[PDB]
Design a protein around this nucleic acid. Sequence first.
RNA 1: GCGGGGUGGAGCAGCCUGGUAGCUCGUCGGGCUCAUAACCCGAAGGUCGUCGGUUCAAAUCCGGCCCCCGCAACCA
RNA 2: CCGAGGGUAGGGCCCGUGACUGGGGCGAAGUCGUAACAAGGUAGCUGUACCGGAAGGUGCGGCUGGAU
RNA 3: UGGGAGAGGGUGGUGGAAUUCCCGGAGUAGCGGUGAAAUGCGCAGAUACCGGGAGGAACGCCGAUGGCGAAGGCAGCCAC
RNA 4: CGAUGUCGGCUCGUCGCAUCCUGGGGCUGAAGAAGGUCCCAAGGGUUGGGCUGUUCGCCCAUUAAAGCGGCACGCGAGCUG
RNA 5: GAAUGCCGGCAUGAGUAACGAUAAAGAGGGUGAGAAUCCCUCUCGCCGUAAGCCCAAGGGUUCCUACGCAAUGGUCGUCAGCGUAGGGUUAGGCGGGACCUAAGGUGAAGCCGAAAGGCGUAGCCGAAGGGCAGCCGGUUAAUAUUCCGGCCCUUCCCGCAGGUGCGAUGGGGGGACGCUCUAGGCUAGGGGGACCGGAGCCAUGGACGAGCCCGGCCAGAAGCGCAGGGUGGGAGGUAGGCAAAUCCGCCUCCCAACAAGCUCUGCGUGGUGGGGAAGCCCGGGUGACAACCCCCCGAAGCCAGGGAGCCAAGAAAAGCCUCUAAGCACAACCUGCGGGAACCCGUACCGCAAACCGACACAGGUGGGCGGGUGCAAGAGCACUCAGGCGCGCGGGAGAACCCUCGCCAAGGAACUCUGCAAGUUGGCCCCGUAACUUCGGGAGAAGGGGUGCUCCCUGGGGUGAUGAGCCCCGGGGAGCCGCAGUGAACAGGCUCUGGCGACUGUUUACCAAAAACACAGCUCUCUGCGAACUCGUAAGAGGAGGUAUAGGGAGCGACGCUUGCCCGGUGCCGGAAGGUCAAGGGGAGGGGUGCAAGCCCCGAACCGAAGCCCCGGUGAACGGCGGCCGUAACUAUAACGGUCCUAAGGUAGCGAAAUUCCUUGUCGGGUAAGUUCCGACCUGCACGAAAAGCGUAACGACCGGAGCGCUGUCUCGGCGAGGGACCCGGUGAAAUUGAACUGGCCGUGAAGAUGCGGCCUACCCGUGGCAGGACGAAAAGACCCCGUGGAGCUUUACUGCAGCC
RNA 6: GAGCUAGCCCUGGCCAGGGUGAAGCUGGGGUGAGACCCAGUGGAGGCCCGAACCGGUGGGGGAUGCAAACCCCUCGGAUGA
Lengths: 48, 275
Amino acid sequence: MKRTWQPNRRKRAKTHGFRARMRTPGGRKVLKRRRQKGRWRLTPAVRK
Amino acid sequence: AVKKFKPYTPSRRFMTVADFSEITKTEPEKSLVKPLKKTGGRNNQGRITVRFRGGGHKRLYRIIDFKRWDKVGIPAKVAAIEYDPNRSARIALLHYVDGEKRYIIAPDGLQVGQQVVAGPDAPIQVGNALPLRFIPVGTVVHAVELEPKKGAKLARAAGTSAQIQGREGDYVILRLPSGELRKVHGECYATVGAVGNADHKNIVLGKAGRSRWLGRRPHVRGAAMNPVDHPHGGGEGRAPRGRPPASPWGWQTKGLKTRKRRKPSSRFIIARRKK
RNA sequence: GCGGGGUGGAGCAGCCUGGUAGCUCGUCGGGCUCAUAACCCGAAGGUCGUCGGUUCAAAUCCGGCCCCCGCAACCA
RNA sequence: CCGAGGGUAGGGCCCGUGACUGGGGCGAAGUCGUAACAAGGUAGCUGUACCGGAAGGUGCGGCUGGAU
RNA sequence: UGGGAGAGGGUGGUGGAAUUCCCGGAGUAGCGGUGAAAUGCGCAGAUACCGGGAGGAACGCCGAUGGCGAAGGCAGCCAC
RNA sequence: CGAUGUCGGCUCGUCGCAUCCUGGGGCUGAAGAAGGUCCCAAGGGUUGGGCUGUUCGCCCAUUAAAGCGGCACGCGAGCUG
RNA sequence: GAAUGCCGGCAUGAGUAACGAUAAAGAGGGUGAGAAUCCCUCUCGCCGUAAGCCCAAGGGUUCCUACGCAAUGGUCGUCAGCGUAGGGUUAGGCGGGACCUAAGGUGAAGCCGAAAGGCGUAGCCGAAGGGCAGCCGGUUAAUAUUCCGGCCCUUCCCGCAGGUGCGAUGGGGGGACGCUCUAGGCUAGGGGGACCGGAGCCAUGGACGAGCCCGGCCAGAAGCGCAGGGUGGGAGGUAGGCAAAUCCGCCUCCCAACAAGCUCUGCGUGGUGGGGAAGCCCGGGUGACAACCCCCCGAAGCCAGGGAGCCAAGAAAAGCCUCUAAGCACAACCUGCGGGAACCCGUACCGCAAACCGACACAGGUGGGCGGGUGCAAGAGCACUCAGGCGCGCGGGAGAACCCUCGCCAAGGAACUCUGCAAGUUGGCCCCGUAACUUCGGGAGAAGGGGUGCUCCCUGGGGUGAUGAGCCCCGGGGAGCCGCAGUGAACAGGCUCUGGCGACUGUUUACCAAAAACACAGCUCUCUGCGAACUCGUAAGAGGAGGUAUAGGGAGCGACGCUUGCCCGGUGCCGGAAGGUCAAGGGGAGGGGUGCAAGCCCCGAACCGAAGCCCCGGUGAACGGCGGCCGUAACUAUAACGGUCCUAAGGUAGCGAAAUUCCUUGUCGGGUAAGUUCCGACCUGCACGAAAAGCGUAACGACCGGAGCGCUGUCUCGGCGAGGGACCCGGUGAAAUUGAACUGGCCGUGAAGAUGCGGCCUACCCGUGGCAGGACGAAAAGACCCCGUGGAGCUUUACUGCAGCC
RNA sequence: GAGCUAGCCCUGGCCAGGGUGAAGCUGGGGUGAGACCCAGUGGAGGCCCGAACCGGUGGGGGAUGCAAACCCCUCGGAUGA
Ligand SMILES: [K+]
Ligand SMILES: [K+]
Ligand SMILES: [Mg+2]
Ligand SMILES: [Mg+2]
Ligand SMILES: [Mg+2]
Ligand SMILES: [Mg+2]
Ligand SMILES: [Mg+2]
Ligand SMILES: [Mg+2]
Ligand SMILES: [Mg+2]
Ligand SMILES: [Mg+2]
Ligand SMILES: [Mg+2]
Ligand SMILES: [Mg+2]
Ligand SMILES: [Mg+2]
Ligand SMILES: [Mg+2]
Ligand SMILES: [Mg+2]
Ligand SMILES: [Mg+2]
Ligand SMILES: [Mg+2]
Ligand SMILES: [Mg+2]
Ligand SMILES: [Mg+2]
Ligand SMILES: [Mg+2]
Ligand SMILES: [Mg+2]
Ligand SMILES: [Mg+2]
Ligand SMILES: [Mg+2]
Ligand SMILES: [Mg+2]
Ligand SMILES: [Mg+2]
Ligand SMILES: [Mg+2]
Ligand SMILES: [Mg+2]
Ligand SMILES: [Mg+2]
Ligand SMILES: [Mg+2]
Ligand SMILES: [Mg+2]
Ligand SMILES: [Mg+2]
Ligand SMILES: [Mg+2]
Ligand SMILES: [Mg+2]
Ligand SMILES: [Mg+2]
Ligand SMILES: [Mg+2]
Ligand SMILES: [Mg+2]
Ligand SMILES: [Mg+2]
Ligand SMILES: [Mg+2]
Ligand SMILES: [Mg+2]
Ligand SMILES: [Mg+2]
Ligand SMILES: [Mg+2]
Ligand SMILES: [Mg+2]
Ligand SMILES: [Mg+2]
Ligand SMILES: [Mg+2]
Ligand SMILES: [Mg+2]
Ligand SMILES: [Mg+2]
Ligand SMILES: [Mg+2]
Ligand SMILES: [Mg+2]
Ligand SMILES: [Mg+2]
Ligand SMILES: [Mg+2]
Ligand SMILES: [Mg+2]
Ligand SMILES: [Mg+2]
Ligand SMILES: [Mg+2]
Ligand SMILES: [Mg+2]
Ligand SMILES: [Mg+2]
Ligand SMILES: [Mg+2]
Ligand SMILES: [Mg+2]
Ligand SMILES: [Mg+2]
Ligand SMILES: [Mg+2]
Ligand SMILES: [Mg+2]
Ligand SMILES: [Mg+2]
Ligand SMILES: [Mg+2]
Ligand SMILES: [Mg+2]
Ligand SMILES: [Mg+2]
Ligand SMILES: [Mg+2]
Ligand SMILES: [Mg+2]
Ligand SMILES: [Mg+2]
Ligand SMILES: [Mg+2]
Ligand SMILES: [Mg+2]
Ligand SMILES: [Mg+2]
Ligand SMILES: [Mg+2]
Ligand SMILES: [Mg+2]
Ligand SMILES: [Mg+2]
Ligand SMILES: [Mg+2]
Ligand SMILES: [Mg+2]
Ligand SMILES: [Mg+2]
Ligand SMILES: [Mg+2]
Ligand SMILES: [Mg+2]
Ligand SMILES: [Mg+2]
Ligand SMILES: [Mg+2]
Ligand SMILES: [Mg+2]
Ligand SMILES: [Mg+2]
Ligand SMILES: [Mg+2]
Ligand SMILES: [Mg+2]
Ligand SMILES: [Mg+2]
Ligand SMILES: [Mg+2]
Ligand SMILES: [Mg+2]
Ligand SMILES: [Mg+2]
Ligand SMILES: [Mg+2]
Ligand SMILES: [Mg+2]
Ligand SMILES: [Mg+2]
Ligand SMILES: [Mg+2]
Ligand SMILES: [Mg+2]
Ligand SMILES: [Mg+2]
Ligand SMILES: [Mg+2]
Ligand SMILES: [Mg+2]
Ligand SMILES: [Mg+2]
Ligand SMILES: [Mg+2]
Ligand SMILES: [Mg+2]
Ligand SMILES: [Mg+2]
Ligand SMILES: [Mg+2]
Ligand SMILES: [Mg+2]
Ligand SMILES: [Mg+2]
Ligand SMILES: [Mg+2]
Ligand SMILES: [Mg+2]
Ligand SMILES: [Mg+2]
Ligand SMILES: [Mg+2]
Ligand SMILES: [Mg+2]
Ligand SMILES: [Mg+2]
Ligand SMILES: [Mg+2]
Ligand SMILES: [Mg+2]
Ligand SMILES: [Mg+2]
Ligand SMILES: [Mg+2]
Ligand SMILES: [Mg+2]
Ligand SMILES: [Mg+2]
Ligand SMILES: [Mg+2]
Ligand SMILES: [Mg+2]
Ligand SMILES: [Mg+2]
Ligand SMILES: [Mg+2]
Ligand SMILES: [Mg+2]
Ligand SMILES: [Mg+2]
Ligand SMILES: [Mg+2]
Ligand SMILES: [Mg+2]
Ligand SMILES: [Mg+2]
Ligand SMILES: [Mg+2]
Ligand SMILES: [Mg+2]
Ligand SMILES: [Mg+2]
Ligand SMILES: [Mg+2]
Ligand SMILES: [Mg+2]
Ligand SMILES: [Mg+2]
Ligand SMILES: [Mg+2]
Ligand SMILES: [Mg+2]
Ligand SMILES: [Mg+2]
Ligand SMILES: [Mg+2]
Ligand SMILES: [Mg+2]
Ligand SMILES: [Mg+2]
Ligand SMILES: [Mg+2]
Ligand SMILES: [Mg+2]
Ligand SMILES: [Mg+2]
Ligand SMILES: [Mg+2]
Ligand SMILES: [Mg+2]
Ligand SMILES: [Mg+2]
Ligand SMILES: [Mg+2]
Ligand SMILES: [Mg+2]
Ligand SMILES: [Mg+2]
Ligand SMILES: [Mg+2]
Ligand SMILES: [Mg+2]
Ligand SMILES: [Mg+2]
Ligand SMILES: [Mg+2]
Ligand SMILES: [Mg+2]
Ligand SMILES: [Mg+2]
Ligand SMILES: [Mg+2]
Ligand SMILES: [Mg+2]
Ligand SMILES: [Mg+2]
Ligand SMILES: [Mg+2]
Ligand SMILES: [Mg+2]
Ligand SMILES: [Mg+2]
Ligand SMILES: [Mg+2]
Ligand SMILES: [Mg+2]
Ligand SMILES: [Mg+2]
Ligand SMILES: [Mg+2]
Ligand SMILES: [Mg+2]
Ligand SMILES: [Mg+2]
Ligand SMILES: [Mg+2]
Ligand SMILES: [Mg+2]
Ligand SMILES: [Mg+2]
Ligand SMILES: [Mg+2]
Ligand SMILES: [Mg+2]
Ligand SMILES: [Mg+2]
Ligand SMILES: [Mg+2]
Ligand SMILES: [Mg+2]
Ligand SMILES: [Mg+2]
Ligand SMILES: [Mg+2]
Ligand SMILES: [Mg+2]
Ligand SMILES: [Mg+2]
Ligand SMILES: [Mg+2]
Ligand SMILES: [Mg+2]
Ligand SMILES: [Mg+2]
Ligand SMILES: [Mg+2]
Ligand SMILES: [Mg+2]
Ligand SMILES: [Mg+2]
Ligand SMILES: [Mg+2]
Ligand SMILES: [Mg+2]
Ligand SMILES: [Mg+2]
Ligand SMILES: [Mg+2]
Ligand SMILES: [Mg+2]
Ligand SMILES: [Mg+2]
Ligand SMILES: [Mg+2]
Ligand SMILES: [Mg+2]
Ligand SMILES: [Mg+2]
Ligand SMILES: [Mg+2]
Ligand SMILES: [Mg+2]
Ligand SMILES: [Mg+2]
Ligand SMILES: [Mg+2]
Ligand SMILES: [Mg+2]
Ligand SMILES: [Mg+2]
Ligand SMILES: [Mg+2]
Ligand SMILES: [Mg+2]
Ligand SMILES: [Mg+2]
Ligand SMILES: [Mg+2]
Ligand SMILES: [Mg+2]
Ligand SMILES: [Mg+2]
Ligand SMILES: [Mg+2]
Ligand SMILES: [Mg+2]
Ligand SMILES: [Mg+2]
Ligand SMILES: [Mg+2]
Ligand SMILES: [Mg+2]
Ligand SMILES: [Mg+2]
Ligand SMILES: [Mg+2]
Ligand SMILES: [Mg+2]
Ligand SMILES: [Mg+2]
Ligand SMILES: [Mg+2]
Ligand SMILES: [Mg+2]
Ligand SMILES: [Mg+2]
Ligand SMILES: [Mg+2]
Ligand SMILES: [Mg+2]
Ligand SMILES: [Mg+2]
Ligand SMILES: [Mg+2]
Ligand SMILES: [Mg+2]
Ligand SMILES: [Mg+2]
Ligand SMILES: [Mg+2]
Ligand SMILES: [Mg+2]
Ligand SMILES: [Mg+2]
Ligand SMILES: [Mg+2]
Ligand SMILES: [Mg+2]
Ligand SMILES: [Mg+2]
Ligand SMILES: [Mg+2]
Ligand SMILES: [Mg+2]
Ligand SMILES: [Mg+2]
Ligand SMILES: [Mg+2]
Ligand SMILES: [Mg+2]
Ligand SMILES: [Mg+2]
Ligand SMILES: [Mg+2]
Ligand SMILES: [Mg+2]
Ligand SMILES: [Mg+2]
Ligand SMILES: [Mg+2]
Ligand SMILES: [Mg+2]
Ligand SMILES: [Mg+2]
Ligand SMILES: [Mg+2]
Ligand SMILES: [Mg+2]
Ligand SMILES: [Mg+2]
Ligand SMILES: [Mg+2]
Ligand SMILES: [Mg+2]
Ligand SMILES: [Mg+2]
Ligand SMILES: [Mg+2]
Ligand SMILES: [Mg+2]
Ligand SMILES: [Mg+2]
Ligand SMILES: [Mg+2]
Ligand SMILES: [Mg+2]
Ligand SMILES: [Mg+2]
Ligand SMILES: [Mg+2]
Ligand SMILES: [Mg+2]
Ligand SMILES: [Mg+2]
Ligand SMILES: [Mg+2]
Ligand SMILES: [Mg+2]
Ligand SMILES: [Mg+2]
Ligand SMILES: [Mg+2]
Ligand SMILES: [Mg+2]
Ligand SMILES: [Mg+2]
Ligand SMILES: [Mg+2]
Ligand SMILES: [Mg+2]
Ligand SMILES: [Mg+2]
Ligand SMILES: [Mg+2]
Ligand SMILES: [Mg+2]
Ligand SMILES: [Mg+2]
Ligand SMILES: [Mg+2]
């Protein structure tokens, strides 16, 4: 049946993307946190 | 004269439609339409602030001319009478001798191809538009400004009217479609005659689907929900109201007056509505 | 199992707050009418379901008994 | 081939009967009231409407087959 | 052909009297109702009195034992 | 109660005997035939249907007879629901 | 040494289940150390509105080639979507950007909010919508509207010529629109040809034929031809389109109108450029100077912005055309012609799937286009079949029980069972024919019946063509033939009577309930006069609505018919300027503290003093409620009638053992041989009753009852058969569970149901196929129940607050 | 976090083929004129049958599954809410 992951690159980037995070106080904290933990990618990789 | 159908389906048994006899033109004046944004009852927060709305026919909004002191003394001819899906009434297309074209709502009896006019000197005649102080006492009147130069606010729906009871200073006494006696300022423009399409309330929507076309979504009774949803929710089996019948938001809904008690316009209402 | 009730012939007061049994109808005698009813004037009939106790004194207060209506008997 | 009739299916008319139900007729001495005949004690009748244990009553309009 | 009477019918218009209600005034101890009363209404200012307003319905006098209509029935006044 | 699945039905049986039938007896208010009551006896048998979820019970048509109880109200790692 | 401990390791079950659609396989030949599994050939089966082909999303080298087989592949592997390496994606015209706008996002102005931030006009961003210039063939192992070949076209810059009042971010036009139905003419696509081209073939009894088989086209500028779309021309006035305007709008006059003319598309033709089958020979070569024509069917696509009808009344902005404004008219714009200029990103491969989403090469999910032929009334239905693609990544045997999926059945025919559950039956078309009832539509495919193939003869009408032949589509009549059977295979209603509920089509608990529930048109109450009420928000601001009482909110009821009674004492709401009570505040009789005193400081009664509350009224389609005992008639029985107590008033019409009736399987009637169900009545209604609507109601229902006909393996009562499993052999190989185990029956005993204790009885050791009585078998720290001064959802005249409102 | 799901907004797309035959319109009859009747033409509808597509009614299988909702046989809607 229809599962819950239906990939969409525009939807992925307009929702979790770098610019989506920077626009919002909570988003900037995600970047600050994932940067402080040392994550290799701060943001989902989507091929655009 | 509302139109009936034979009962060749269940729904055609009682469905009635308007006869559209007065209509003389079937597509709008391109220079006078502009797109109507459907809201689905949602406000700018994205939130339903009016339940049960949405999903009706697409419409073009037709720019109606509710101020007619815009063109005092310039007579217009009545070019056509047209279907407006944004209001219960039919609208009339006017060609002023200026060449400017405009829309008004069409009073009862208005004849396609007749002269209408606005101004303190206009003839007391179906379609003309004088400030209230020059219209004779006892006249039926429609599209009435509430305040001078603010726009026709009163008596705009199909078949409705207002009657002038008397004058008292810078003010006249109107009996509204609701039956209330109000004091409206004399310099407020109005339009002699009653709004047309008086048969509009005799329409029988006929079936659920016809209401969906008009943008009305199904309306679910409080008594059918659960307590988390509505004062009438819950109960094992059916249930009487079990309290003063109330809205979803708590307040009583059988008799509770809701007009603000200290509203400035209270000084201008002589009698609340009948009936 | 929890509750209320039982008093002239009928239906009800008085019981809480001990000493005084009351109201309407009915029944009995007379009146009026040709006569009956209605109406008017008078009268009788209740030891207060019962046994026991409390008290100077019990329809009344407290117990046991007979009765007569009720409300209830849910989770499996 | 037609063909008495036989068989399956579905109709129409009549008759008999049926728990129960409706009013009707009749029946020496039943219970309740007193509607009508006198202005019958609210003049009667009336078509309709609603109501009421019952006769009836009331509204609207009609008739004199109404008295003084 | 020329004339006459008429609440004959239909439409639209409109005139005064009255009842009710509403607002202003003035005013106070009762009003109303009946066989008699009571319900009811009234010092939260009624009834009675003047001025204003709204609204519906019916047309006093003329009016008759009258007139019109096929009947049912038709009455302020005005035009068609 | 860190679970022993709870009515009935179906299937499959097995046992008890306080015996419904069939076998053997005594008494009879046992003439015969057919009954009644008690004793012995558990080998075998103990039907098909209508109604209701029903157990049970009533009813139809038979029968030699249409027994009553136990097996976790026998049997859901056998079925049903 | 125990914590259903934690981490890891290795056991058990076990060589067990399984190896993922039952579309299906067999042989020969290759390669290789090794072959059921890789390659080739022949035979067989399967998909064919796909199981074929092409786009988009998503995936991201999976594509091609060479060399490999440790791991991955459910077996094998020499193969592979696997390992190593090399190669591969080419555009002015396809898609997107350098163009436009939609919701929405954002946001100079501006508004609001402790901070963070939230709004918001224009503007900007935003596409699968608008706009915009490429078609055919060839080539590579792998890209191709991209490379090459042919024939076409677009923009930008510059130049030349001719013309022109040129000029825009501004004005106007246009772009520009729905749903159903639909005309004419085309094309796509297809069928036939006794015409044209073709390697051949003659079998096995006949056939050298008007024989079989194969094929008979694609693209194209100007011009031309057919069919369509769009479009009035001149003039005079002008005050409107937020400056101007010769444009546009309005008025008048002349002329032109189902035309013509101009313009623009589609189709046809068209200089040219291509392509081109079977079959044979090794993807190719030949065929081949291949031929390339006629008739018919014919779109849902094209002409297209076409036509008609209807109501629910159907985007924007740019490109484009026109009008002018500053400005400038040595300029600029328009037309024609020429040379030059033309950038960035995508392009491999998969794509109904073994490469996407489902942890798997997973019987599931995934949007658009093409989707051939014959027959069956039609069709994308069904059977077979083309092109093309496949046999589903374990096989070989055997022929038990048992399970699954399937076929048949003597006599009976619901006797099965909670229930005809299930499975039969019926089944398409054509004609005959069809009841109660009804809202006149219906009920209706009611019911029930008859026909249905093949052959010959006669014949009526249409389409194309021409009016004929041919082809093609509807038919009518007569005579015959065959079989058990003619919708001969596949696809394709069982029907009727009767209740309950709900009017109806609709909607619902994704994943145990599809219903009688929700919705619904309709009816009623109530709020709301507009800066509305109401709703979201601290606010600004939104929605309501660019709506205005024939409107919008809330509430109940729920098509329709006939109807909806009595109670306002309590609660709610509405009304009520009196009176009562009432907080802050006003007032300040009268006191008090202190100081030498002036003074400073505190207490403070009467009285004035909102809403709310009381108090007086109204109000039921507001919350709600609508009695008890006793007596009475000339047989009895029962009470129309009376008596009395209580109420705010004592249930009206109509229904009634009911989705409601406890006693209850009430009583009677019907249906049955028999009826706790069912249907019709009765009425002492435990405990109906009128918008939580009362009583009916044609029609409708995958709802729930009851009956009958039909037909049946449901059953008496089971039998046989098929295939996939199970079973045996080779390969690969789990699981939950498990204190350890050398793990019998009876009668007892025991924490009261013992393989483990006692006594007796029985039993040689170890397996395999089977059955499920036990191991209080497995699973899940019982949902029930209680306990915890544990938790959470919900309610209210529980407490206490808060938003909101007054 | 609305790439599942529920609703709404904008913009596109999809619904084989059969059946029934409303209003209107045309003609004929009828009347003082009408209503109205009949035939044709017409193509209405939360209309009828049935693929796609959307569903999920009954039964059976599956139940350490092909699948953490599947498969088979039946069945509902299919121009509309
Ligand atoms: K337990
Ligand atoms: K319980
Ligand atoms: Mg889903
Ligand atoms: Mg999605
Ligand atoms: Mg995307
Ligand atoms: Mg996208
Ligand atoms: Mg997206
Ligand atoms: Mg999205
Ligand atoms: Mg976002
Ligand atoms: Mg972003
Ligand atoms: Mg920050
Ligand atoms: Mg990481
Ligand atoms: Mg790094
Ligand atoms: Mg992130
Ligand atoms: Mg109608
Ligand atoms: Mg009209
Ligand atoms: Mg526009
Ligand atoms: Mg809006
Ligand atoms: Mg937001
Ligand atoms: Mg709302
Ligand atoms: Mg809404
Ligand atoms: Mg309108
Ligand atoms: Mg309106
Ligand atoms: Mg005013
Ligand atoms: Mg209405
Ligand atoms: Mg609408
Ligand atoms: Mg509702
Ligand atoms: Mg509810
Ligand atoms: Mg509920
Ligand atoms: Mg909630
Ligand atoms: Mg609540
Ligand atoms: Mg409630
Ligand atoms: Mg409820
Ligand atoms: Mg409920
Ligand atoms: Mg209830
Ligand atoms: Mg109620
Ligand atoms: Mg209640
Ligand atoms: Mg209640
Ligand atoms: Mg309330
Ligand atoms: Mg409020
Ligand atoms: Mg008012
Ligand atoms: Mg007594
Ligand atoms: Mg008394
Ligand atoms: Mg007392
Ligand atoms: Mg005393
Ligand atoms: Mg007497
Ligand atoms: Mg005593
Ligand atoms: Mg004593
Ligand atoms: Mg409980
Ligand atoms: Mg129990
Ligand atoms: Mg015959
Ligand atoms: Mg015979
Ligand atoms: Mg016969
Ligand atoms: Mg009398
Ligand atoms: Mg009399
Ligand atoms: Mg009398
Ligand atoms: Mg009388
Ligand atoms: Mg009366
Ligand atoms: Mg007084
Ligand atoms: Mg006073
Ligand atoms: Mg009035
Ligand atoms: Mg355990
Ligand atoms: Mg357990
Ligand atoms: Mg059985
Ligand atoms: Mg014997
Ligand atoms: Mg003897
Ligand atoms: Mg004897
Ligand atoms: Mg025996
Ligand atoms: Mg039984
Ligand atoms: Mg039992
Ligand atoms: Mg019983
Ligand atoms: Mg015997
Ligand atoms: Mg037993
Ligand atoms: Mg047990
Ligand atoms: Mg058991
Ligand atoms: Mg027991
Ligand atoms: Mg079980
Ligand atoms: Mg069981
Ligand atoms: Mg059991
Ligand atoms: Mg078990
Ligand atoms: Mg059950
Ligand atoms: Mg069940
Ligand atoms: Mg230890
Ligand atoms: Mg632990
Ligand atoms: Mg662990
Ligand atoms: Mg481990
Ligand atoms: Mg390790
Ligand atoms: Mg291990
Ligand atoms: Mg071991
Ligand atoms: Mg092992
Ligand atoms: Mg084993
Ligand atoms: Mg085995
Ligand atoms: Mg397994
Ligand atoms: Mg498997
Ligand atoms: Mg299959
Ligand atoms: Mg199969
Ligand atoms: Mg197949
Ligand atoms: Mg072979
Ligand atoms: Mg090798
Ligand atoms: Mg191999
Ligand atoms: Mg090998
Ligand atoms: Mg194979
Ligand atoms: Mg091969
Ligand atoms: Mg095909
Ligand atoms: Mg397959
Ligand atoms: Mg991937
Ligand atoms: Mg390997
Ligand atoms: Mg190897
Ligand atoms: Mg290696
Ligand atoms: Mg492997
Ligand atoms: Mg392997
Ligand atoms: Mg695998
Ligand atoms: Mg290997
Ligand atoms: Mg490549
Ligand atoms: Mg190119
Ligand atoms: Mg550039
Ligand atoms: Mg843009
Ligand atoms: Mg913002
Ligand atoms: Mg911040
Ligand atoms: Mg900010
Ligand atoms: Mg954007
Ligand atoms: Mg953009
Ligand atoms: Mg685009
Ligand atoms: Mg392009
Ligand atoms: Mg081209
Ligand atoms: Mg090509
Ligand atoms: Mg110019
Ligand atoms: Mg321009
Ligand atoms: Mg347009
Ligand atoms: Mg438009
Ligand atoms: Mg568009
Ligand atoms: Mg429409
Ligand atoms: Mg072509
Ligand atoms: Mg064809
Ligand atoms: Mg002017
Ligand atoms: Mg050659
Ligand atoms: Mg299409
Ligand atoms: Mg088109
Ligand atoms: Mg058109
Ligand atoms: Mg816009
Ligand atoms: Mg200048
Ligand atoms: Mg110059
Ligand atoms: Mg030019
Ligand atoms: Mg660039
Ligand atoms: Mg490519
Ligand atoms: Mg592909
Ligand atoms: Mg599929
Ligand atoms: Mg597809
Ligand atoms: Mg594929
Ligand atoms: Mg593939
Ligand atoms: Mg993969
Ligand atoms: Mg999964
Ligand atoms: Mg596979
Ligand atoms: Mg798959
Ligand atoms: Mg073909
Ligand atoms: Mg067919
Ligand atoms: Mg494929
Ligand atoms: Mg074997
Ligand atoms: Mg067969
Ligand atoms: Mg048989
Ligand atoms: Mg039978
Ligand atoms: Mg039979
Ligand atoms: Mg049966
Ligand atoms: Mg059932
Ligand atoms: Mg069935
Ligand atoms: Mg019948
Ligand atoms: Mg019938
Ligand atoms: Mg009919
Ligand atoms: Mg038929
Ligand atoms: Mg038939
Ligand atoms: Mg029927
Ligand atoms: Mg025949
Ligand atoms: Mg034949
Ligand atoms: Mg069939
Ligand atoms: Mg069928
Ligand atoms: Mg019943
Ligand atoms: Mg329904
Ligand atoms: Mg109903
Ligand atoms: Mg109904
Ligand atoms: Mg309904
Ligand atoms: Mg439907
Ligand atoms: Mg569910
Ligand atoms: Mg659920
Ligand atoms: Mg779920
Ligand atoms: Mg769930
Ligand atoms: Mg289910
Ligand atoms: Mg349910
Ligand atoms: Mg359903
Ligand atoms: Mg209704
Ligand atoms: Mg709020
Ligand atoms: Mg607020
Ligand atoms: Mg707005
Ligand atoms: Mg409802
Ligand atoms: Mg009522
Ligand atoms: Mg009350
Ligand atoms: Mg009251
Ligand atoms: Mg009250
Ligand atoms: Mg003082
Ligand atoms: Mg006060
Ligand atoms: Mg009450
Ligand atoms: Mg109550
Ligand atoms: Mg007696
Ligand atoms: Mg009544
Ligand atoms: Mg009853
Ligand atoms: Mg009964
Ligand atoms: Mg009933
Ligand atoms: Mg019930
Ligand atoms: Mg009841
Ligand atoms: Mg009981
Ligand atoms: Mg009962
Ligand atoms: Mg019972
Ligand atoms: Mg019985
Ligand atoms: Mg009875
Ligand atoms: Mg019915
Ligand atoms: Mg019905
Ligand atoms: Mg249904
Ligand atoms: Mg249903
Ligand atoms: Mg049944
Ligand atoms: Mg039956
Ligand atoms: Mg069988
Ligand atoms: Mg077999
Ligand atoms: Mg062996
Ligand atoms: Mg292996
Ligand atoms: Mg394990
Ligand atoms: Mg051991
Ligand atoms: Mg052992
Ligand atoms: Mg042993
Ligand atoms: Mg014990
Ligand atoms: Mg033991
Ligand atoms: Mg032992
Ligand atoms: Mg031991
Ligand atoms: Mg021992
Ligand atoms: Mg031992
Ligand atoms: Mg021993
Ligand atoms: Mg033994
Ligand atoms: Mg075994
Ligand atoms: Mg066992
Ligand atoms: Mg077992
Ligand atoms: Mg066991
Ligand atoms: Mg067990
Ligand atoms: Mg725990
Ligand atoms: Mg626990
Ligand atoms: Mg526990
Ligand atoms: Mg638990
Ligand atoms: Mg407990
Ligand atoms: Mg406590
Ligand atoms: Mg405690
Ligand atoms: Mg607690
Ligand atoms: Mg909870
Ligand atoms: Mg809590
Ligand atoms: Mg999405
Ligand atoms: Mg469709
Ligand atoms: Mg037909
Ligand atoms: Mg026709
Ligand atoms: Mg027409
Ligand atoms: Mg339909
Ligand atoms: Mg249907
Ligand atoms: Mg049909
Ligand atoms: Mg299913
Ligand atoms: Mg079935
Ligand atoms: Mg499951
Ligand atoms: Mg399935
Ligand atoms: Mg199927
Ligand atoms: Mg179906
Ligand atoms: Mg259908
Ligand atoms: Mg269809």
